[PDB]
Design an enzyme around this catalytic site. Sequence first.
Site, mmCIF file in Angstrom:
data_model
loop_
_atom_site.group_PDB
_atom_site.id
_atom_site.type_symbol
_atom_site.label_atom_id
_atom_site.label_comp_id
_atom_site.label_asym_id
_atom_site.label_seq_id
_atom_site.Cartn_x
_atom_site.Cartn_y
_atom_site.Cartn_z
ATOM 1 C CG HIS A 266 -2.042 -0.946 1.136
ATOM 2 N ND1 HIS A 266 -2.766 -1.379 2.225
ATOM 3 C CD2 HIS A 266 -2.610 -1.520 0.050
ATOM 4 C CE1 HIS A 266 -3.729 -2.185 1.816
ATOM 5 N NE2 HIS A 266 -3.657 -2.284 0.500
ATOM 6 C CD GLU B 261 -2.232 4.923 2.197
ATOM 7 O OE1 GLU B 261 -2.252 3.715 1.852
ATOM 8 O OE2 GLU B 261 -3.044 5.767 1.728
ATOM 9 C CB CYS C 59 -6.558 -0.025 3.703
ATOM 10 S SG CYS C 59 -5.172 -0.490 4.727
ATOM 11 C CB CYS D 68 -2.207 1.452 5.634
ATOM 12 S SG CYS D 68 -1.841 0.130 4.498
HETATM 13 ZN ZN LIG Z 1 -3.672 0.183 2.894
#
Ligand SMILES: [Zn+2]
Length: 183
Positions: A59, A61, A90, A93
């Site tokens: 991800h 992040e 999400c 994260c």
């Molecule tokens: Zn995420």
Amino acid sequence: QGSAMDPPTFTFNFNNEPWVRGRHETYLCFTMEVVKHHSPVSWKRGVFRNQVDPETHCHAERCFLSWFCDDILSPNTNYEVTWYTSWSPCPECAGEVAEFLARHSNVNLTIFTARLYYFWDTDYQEGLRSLSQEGASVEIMGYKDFKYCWENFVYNDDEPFKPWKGLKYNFLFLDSKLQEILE
Ligand SMILES: [Zn+2]
């Protein structure tokens, strides 16, 4: 740090209609001013781009946090850093982040986001909740910020920012829902 985005890749992924459809990527932009004994010695900034579908933590992040740790976070410093993301994060994260934060006062973060990702899901909500609640500014990227991103993070050809329609309303609504989540 990577590359800037061609204008298409930007306006598409930064289009702020709450229910946009076909945005299989989080585009994460950031400015960061490093600050040693109070004098900002340097400024670095960039664009990480990856998928938003839950396969663990590739991800945006996280690819951020890994890079921050590899090539930066010196021992004694204070950092100023802020994020222009196309999708909110999400909740998993939102976790790894809010955590890293509670664990480092020498990092101050603030988040600007084109969209709220899954804003109606008690679980995603609770993610945003712990980011706000644990020392991070979180808000909906509006006009100011879009122009900002058009000039800084995009191969624009020295051309001017051309807003898309509804951007004003789209903002208005997302912010209503957001102040709602946090209320
Ligand atoms: Zn995420």
